[PDB]
Amino acid sequence: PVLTSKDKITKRMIVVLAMASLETHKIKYVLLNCDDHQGLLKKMGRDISEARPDITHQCLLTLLDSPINKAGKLQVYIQTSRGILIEVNPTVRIPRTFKRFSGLMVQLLHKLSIRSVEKLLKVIKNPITDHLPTKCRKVTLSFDAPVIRVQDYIEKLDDDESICVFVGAMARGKDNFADEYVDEKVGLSNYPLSASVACSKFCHGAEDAWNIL
Amino acid sequence: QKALPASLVPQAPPVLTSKDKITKRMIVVLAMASLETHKIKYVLLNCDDHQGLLKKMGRDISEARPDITHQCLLTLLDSPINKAGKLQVYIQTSRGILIEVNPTVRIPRTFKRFSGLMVQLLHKLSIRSVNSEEKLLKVIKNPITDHLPTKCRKVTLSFDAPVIRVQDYIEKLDDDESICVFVGAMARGKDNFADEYVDEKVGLSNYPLSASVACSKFCHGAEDAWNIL
Amino acid sequence: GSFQHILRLLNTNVDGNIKIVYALTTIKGVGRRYSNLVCKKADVDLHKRAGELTQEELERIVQIMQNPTHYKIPAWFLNTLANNVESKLRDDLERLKKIR
Amino acid sequence: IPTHAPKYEENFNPKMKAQLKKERKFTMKEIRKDAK
RNA sequence: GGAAGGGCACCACCAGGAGUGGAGCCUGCGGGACUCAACACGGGGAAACUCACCAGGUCCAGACACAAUAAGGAUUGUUGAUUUUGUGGGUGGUGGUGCAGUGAUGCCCGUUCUGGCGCGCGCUACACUGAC
RNA sequence: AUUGCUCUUCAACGAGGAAUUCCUAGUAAGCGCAAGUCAUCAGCUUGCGUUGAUUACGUCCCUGCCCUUUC
Lengths: 213, 229, 100, 36
Ligand SMILES: [Mg+2]
Known about the structure:
- The structure is cut from a larger assembly and holds two copies of chain A, one copy of chain C (about 100 residues) and one copy of chain D (about 35 residues).
- Chain A has about 210 residues and is α/β, with parallel strands linked by helices.
- Chain A has helices at about 40-45, 55-65, 65-70, 100-110, 130, 150-155, 195-210; strands at about 15-20, 25, 30, 75-80, 85-90, 120-125, 135-140, 160-170, 185.
- Chain A is globular and about 50 Å long.
- Helix content of chain D is about 55%, strand content about 0%.
- Chain D is built from one helix and no strands.
- Chain D is rod-shaped and about 65 Å long.
- The interface of A and B includes residues 61, 96 and 204 of A.
- Chain A: Belongs to the class IV-like SAM-binding methyltransferase superfamily. RNA methyltransferase NEP1 family.
């Protein structure tokens, strides 16, 4: 069965893409990009470094294309830096190209939902916690945190439990976005990790831990 | 219980190069990269941005997607194994052009700047660093075989091939040897492009895998197997 | 004393491991032959590297370079229109176009 | 491992004095054809 | 049309050596799918769809409380307590938009000027079989 | 302006992709010297001389072109 926020009992891998830099600007509304709109964002006063929705597209691509999504054991939540929280239906097949991804995001943010004929992409009311499973463990990706084997971590946790991973799609910033909800922060690899690799890094171990294959 | 070595300070591992063949290393070949340039200024041909032009060339625009190579390079380049200096990348273009990627490079994350780098590389045949000390991207002479290590195992990613465990596979292989993977960056096509070079083809899973996911999934196996962390 | 691995001469960093002539050539305005002559006037043996140089040798070299004529360095030895042409070319081109 | 950024041009062109010389060659050739 | 028997060819096989194509110089000839339901799909110069867009120069940032100065004069472009000096001090608010003029209303968050190549030759290098 | 010399300045280039052209003995390749003698040529044409190789010198198997059957 397709996993949804309504169902809380089933064990699953939750991945929260915190600090997602998705924003629509009309001159028609178009997703702001670091490269497409440099002069405009200079007028807005925001630095172009933190104007990159490409990272979220890359993280979504690897996560949705990851095995566990195919096995029906993964759901993705995206928290926009502006404060917009987005749920991603596991069944979706997001556009592989970024330009078509940008056009999808602007449709989502304005229409608040995407219907093709269960919302594929649905904007939902904060906080994240109410949507998350009732019994679930929360962790963040921290470089400074101790390095832990993702596989060995998952087995030592319970079976009824689910796991939430809060990954920062931000280009640069302090790793305190999800400190308020999380109970402990862990390190995944010894070297610095990009958000996409960390999501790819994490999901493979759960596949090994849960024998998704 | 043991006295520490003379020097514990961590030093950067050597940057693997085609000249060196002895060291055990990871080789990933992004075979069948769809990278083509055409004067409109030269632009890397894209499936969506350019549709009428490739129709004039007579090439199927389904096989006109360089971003698949971009994401595979991105996920492959940023993998910790590259940070450990145990992985070195080759790209075989659909045209037959072989491109050597130095592990030190940092390709742009956005596709638009990535396209600009390919067209510069394909025309100038090489890319120089900002500090001007090494050629990060260089076109090299085919076949791939001469560049590869003297003792090395060759495998491809085949959906139809038996499903294997990457971690168990790498452990059972010898140490002095190396391992080559030939990944199909094509959106859809038959998996015989590396048949002449490879000796046996392996499947990483039953369900279909994306090219980037398979590269990311495979390399995690080496890092766990080799304790790269 | 200790060999000088690097030296500062005329506001330029010169490596000790290079010979005196081919080290002094690094200085702007100093080539191979000019450095050779400066050394020969300074009465410095050319076989020595730059690091073996004593302070007096370096100071004498400085005064050779700064006062060449005072030390008998030979005088012979020591050291819009384009746009108009473009416009004329354009006039030529347009007239020739009018012919054809 | 060390990381070095690649150097490239945003738009590739395959200074003006060379451009001036290039036009001369075309003008030299074009005139000679007309004379012939 | 077929068949048979022979010969020949660095425009054939075979074995190698030289080049050209990378760099510098010189020079001849010619000028409509969708690993991508939803989006994106006839487009081309960063941006600019008809008064736009891009880059710069002016004007706008006075709530209120207290105290002082102060009518024999604080401040104004000649005026008269509007300000000025010091201490404290709140607010996105000529906001917009969707709903049922009205509503503790859901949602979000400026002004005037000045400029705008394709095909080919030849020579030299990338050193210690070398350079001087 | 012209052609030489002196000094200084000191770049790209670390053997070159897909491909492609030529070549069997005084031959490939390297080096210079002379004359510009009605076409062509001006660091280009021609001539002259000096040093001097590797490999093959066999086949119609692939390709191509022929000969004979006054079959
Ligand atoms: Mg013969």
